[PDB]
Design a binder for this molecule. Structure first.
Ligand SMILES: CC(=O)c1cccc(N2C[C@@H](C(=O)N[C@@H](Cc3ccccc3)[C@H](O)CN(CC(C)C)S(=O)(=O)c3ccc4c(c3)OCO4)OC2=O)c1
Lengths: 99, 99
C-alpha cells in the first residue's frame, strides 16, 4: 500500500502472541519495542534520541509480522512510549520513501 | 525520487542560504534542527523524545528546500541529536511510504 504522512504511520505488528501498533519509522536505524518479556538471549545497549538515551535489551533473529509481511531481525526492547519499526525491518517488507 | 532504507535517508536541505544535512524521519511529528540562528520571532516550546523532554525554539513559516522541493512551515530549533525533517514538512513535499 501507500501510506501518507498526514497522520502518524502506525500499522499493526505481530510478535508472537502479541499484536501492537507501531510506527514505520525511517528515522530509526533499529527497531525499538515497548517493554515485553521475549524468550532467549539478549545483550544490553544504549540508544539515543531527543532528550537523551534509554537502556534497551537487544534480541536477535526475532520474527515479526508487519501488515502481513514477514520480517526477522534484531529487536531492541525498552522503555519507549511507542513501538518503532526501524530501517532494519522496513527494508525486509519492501518499504521505501517516495516524493 | 524513490529512497530505499538500507542507508539513513539523509538529504541536503537549504535554509536561510545555508546547506545542511537532515534525516527524513517519518516517526517525527515535527521538524527539529540543531542549534542555529534564524530571523524573526520565536516561541519557547518543549517537546518529548525517546530520552525525555527538551526545550526548543519554535519558528513559524520558515522556507526550507528539501532535496529540491519547497516547503514553508514550522521549524523547531534545539538539542536534537541530528537534524530531522518531520511529518509537518514531509507532507508538504509530498512524501509517502510505500511497500
Ligand atoms: C509523549 C512523547 O514522548 C511524544 C509526544 C509527541 C511527539 C513525540 N515525538 C518525538 C519525536 C521523535 O523523537 N521521534 C522518534 C520516534 C519516536 C516517536 C515518539 C516517541 C518517541 C520516539 C524518531 O522517529 C526516531 N528517533 C531517532 C531520531 C530522533 C533521530 S529515536 O530516538 O526514537 C530512535 C529510534 C531508533 C533508534 C535510535 C533512536 O537509535 C538507534 O535506533 O517525534 C515525535 O512525534 C513524542
Amino acid at each position: 500500500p501507500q501510506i501518507t504522512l498526514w497522520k502518524r504511520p502506525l500499522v499493526t505488528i505481530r510478535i508472537g502472541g502479541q499484536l501492537k501498533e507501531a510506527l514505520l519509522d525511517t528515522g530509526a536505524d533499529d527497531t525499538v519495542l515497548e517493554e515485553m518479556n521475549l524468550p532467549g538471549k539478549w545483550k544490553p545497549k544504549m540508544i539515543g534520541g531527543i532528550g537523551g538515551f534509554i537502556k534497551v535489551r537487544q534480541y536477535d533473529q526475532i520474527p515479526i509480522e508487519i501488515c502481513g509481511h514477514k520480517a526477522i531481525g534484531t529487536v531492541l526492547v525498552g522503555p519507549t512510549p511507542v513501538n518503532i519499526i526501524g530501517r532494519n525491518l522496513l527494508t525486509q517488507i519492501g518499504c521505501t520513501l517516495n516524493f
